[PDB]
Design a protein around this motif. Structure first.
Motif, mmCIF file in Angstrom:
data_model
loop_
_atom_site.group_PDB
_atom_site.id
_atom_site.type_symbol
_atom_site.label_atom_id
_atom_site.label_comp_id
_atom_site.label_asym_id
_atom_site.label_seq_id
_atom_site.Cartn_x
_atom_site.Cartn_y
_atom_site.Cartn_z
ATOM 1 N N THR A 76 7.682 -73.437 24.099
ATOM 2 C CA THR A 76 9.096 -72.703 23.984
ATOM 3 C C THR A 76 9.781 -72.893 23.483
ATOM 4 O O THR A 76 9.608 -74.095 22.755
ATOM 5 N N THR A 89 16.727 -63.368 43.759
ATOM 6 C CA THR A 89 16.599 -63.612 42.293
ATOM 7 C C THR A 89 17.239 -62.320 41.949
ATOM 8 O O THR A 89 18.483 -62.034 42.234
ATOM 9 N N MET A 128 13.390 -68.848 29.813
ATOM 10 C CA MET A 128 12.825 -69.309 30.858
ATOM 11 C C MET A 128 13.037 -70.915 31.871
ATOM 12 O O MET A 128 12.993 -69.988 33.081
ATOM 13 N N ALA A 129 14.559 -70.539 31.195
ATOM 14 C CA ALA A 129 15.636 -71.918 31.442
ATOM 15 C C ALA A 129 16.715 -72.003 31.395
ATOM 16 O O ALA A 129 16.462 -71.382 29.549
ATOM 17 N N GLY A 162 17.910 -76.492 31.521
ATOM 18 C CA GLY A 162 16.562 -77.339 32.686
ATOM 19 C C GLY A 162 16.473 -75.621 34.146
ATOM 20 O O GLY A 162 15.960 -75.926 34.548
ATOM 21 N N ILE A 163 17.926 -75.127 33.642
ATOM 22 C CA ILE A 163 17.976 -74.232 35.162
ATOM 23 C C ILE A 163 16.873 -73.220 34.970
ATOM 24 O O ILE A 163 16.460 -72.752 34.083
ATOM 25 N N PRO A 164 15.822 -73.286 35.984
ATOM 26 C CA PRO A 164 14.546 -72.209 36.958
ATOM 27 C C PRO A 164 15.513 -71.302 36.497
ATOM 28 O O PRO A 164 15.556 -70.527 37.875
ATOM 29 N N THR A 165 15.755 -70.077 35.675
ATOM 30 C CA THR A 165 15.872 -68.858 36.358
ATOM 31 C C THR A 165 15.646 -68.496 36.347
ATOM 32 O O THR A 165 14.123 -67.012 35.774
ATOM 33 N N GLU A 166 15.011 -68.050 38.382
ATOM 34 C CA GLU A 166 14.570 -67.146 38.818
ATOM 35 C C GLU A 166 15.812 -67.350 40.362
ATOM 36 O O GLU A 166 14.412 -67.762 41.053
ATOM 37 N N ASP A 167 16.325 -67.471 40.124
ATOM 38 C CA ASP A 167 17.422 -67.290 41.619
ATOM 39 C C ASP A 167 18.880 -66.884 41.461
ATOM 40 O O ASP A 167 19.270 -66.954 40.065
ATOM 41 N N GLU A 194 16.026 -72.103 27.204
ATOM 42 C CA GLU A 194 14.421 -72.316 26.925
ATOM 43 C C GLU A 194 13.748 -70.785 26.936
ATOM 44 O O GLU A 194 14.197 -69.870 27.972
ATOM 45 N N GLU A 241 10.644 -68.506 25.258
ATOM 46 C CA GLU A 241 8.669 -68.441 25.165
ATOM 47 C C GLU A 241 8.070 -67.446 24.543
ATOM 48 O O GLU A 241 8.611 -65.881 24.915
#
Length: 122
Positions: free
Chosen positions: A16, A42, A71-72, A75-80, A102, A104
């Motif tokens: 990453t 999502t 992937m984010a 820090g935010i979790p890109t999945e919602d 983020e 990958e």
């Protein structure tokens, strides 16, 4: 699922990288994502870099390819949330004049190339 004699089949690893873009005095980040407006929870898919403005910091680096795999975001979790959420992240990021993306990618592993023409030892 598997297509061919399965078994001893190792895969490469992924790393990453943090993208630091400085909200330019004109083209802040100039980044575009791909998704939708409506959803269930999502986006039924990861936010890929739809487009990258030119003469922008997102392009200047050139580390941001079209259709990346974020992937984010900071820090935010890109999945919602909604595509807007992520979009908002950027804008907001403008505040600190810095946005973190983020990404990958894959990493080369111990393996010999194919004997041909192209890659040269160095």
């Amino acid at each position: 699922g598997s297509s061919g004699s399965s078994g001893a089949g190792q895969v490469v690893h992924t790393e990453t990288t943090e993208v630091v873009l400085t909200a330019d005095p004109v083209t802040g980040f100039g980044i575009q994502l791909q998704g939708s407006v409506f959803a269930t929870e999502t986006l039924s898919s990861p936010p890929l870099i739809s487009y990258i403005e030119a003469d922008s910091p997102a392009e200047r680096c050139g580390v941001l390819q079209i259709g990346d795999r974020v992937m984010a975001i900071n820090g935010i979790p890109t999945e919602d949330s909604t595509f807007e959420e992520a979009n908002q992240l950027l804008r907001d990021s403008s505040i600190t004049s810095k946005v973190t993306l983020e990404i990958e990618f894959d990493v080369a592993e111990s393996v010999i190339p194919s004997s041909g023409s192209g890659p040269s030892s160095g």
